[PDB]
Amino acid sequence: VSCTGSKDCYAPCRKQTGCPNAKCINKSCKCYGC
């Protein structure tokens, strides 16, 4: 699920669980919360 930035990863982050902040890779997104 290739993303671009944290802000990009915020939408899936949220959708999934709702992490405080997120980390992103141009391969996939990374959540915290979860």
Swiss-Prot record:
Site feature: Basic residue of the functional dyad, critical for activity: 23
Keywords: Amidation, Calcium-activated potassium channel impairing toxin, Disulfide bond, Ion channel impairing toxin, Neurotoxin, Potassium channel impairing toxin, Secreted, Toxin, Voltage-gated potassium channel impairing toxin
Function summary: Blocks voltage-gated potassium channels Kv1.2/KCNA2 (IC(50)=0.12-0.8 nM), KCa3.1/KCNN4 (IC(50)=1-2.2 nM), Shaker B (IC(50)=2.39-80 nM), Kv1.1/KCNA1 (IC(50)=37-45 or no activity, depending on the study), Kv1.3/KCNA3 (IC(50)=150-180 or no activity, depending on the study).
Site description Aromatic residue of the functional dyad, residues in chain: 32
Effect of residue 23 to A: 1000-fold decrease in affinity for shaker B
Principal location listed in the UniProt entry: secreted
Protein family per UniProt: Belongs to the short scorpion toxin superfamily. Potassium channel inhibitor family. Alpha-KTx 06 subfamily.
Other comment: Negative results: shows very weak or no activity on KCa1.1/KCNMA1, KCa2.1/KCNN1, KCa2.2/KCNN2, KCa2.3/KCNN3, Kir2.3/KCNJ4.
The name this protein goes by in its record: Potassium channel toxin alpha-KTx 6.2
Domain of life: Eukaryota
Expressed in which tissues: Expressed by the venom gland.
Residues spanning the signal sequence: none
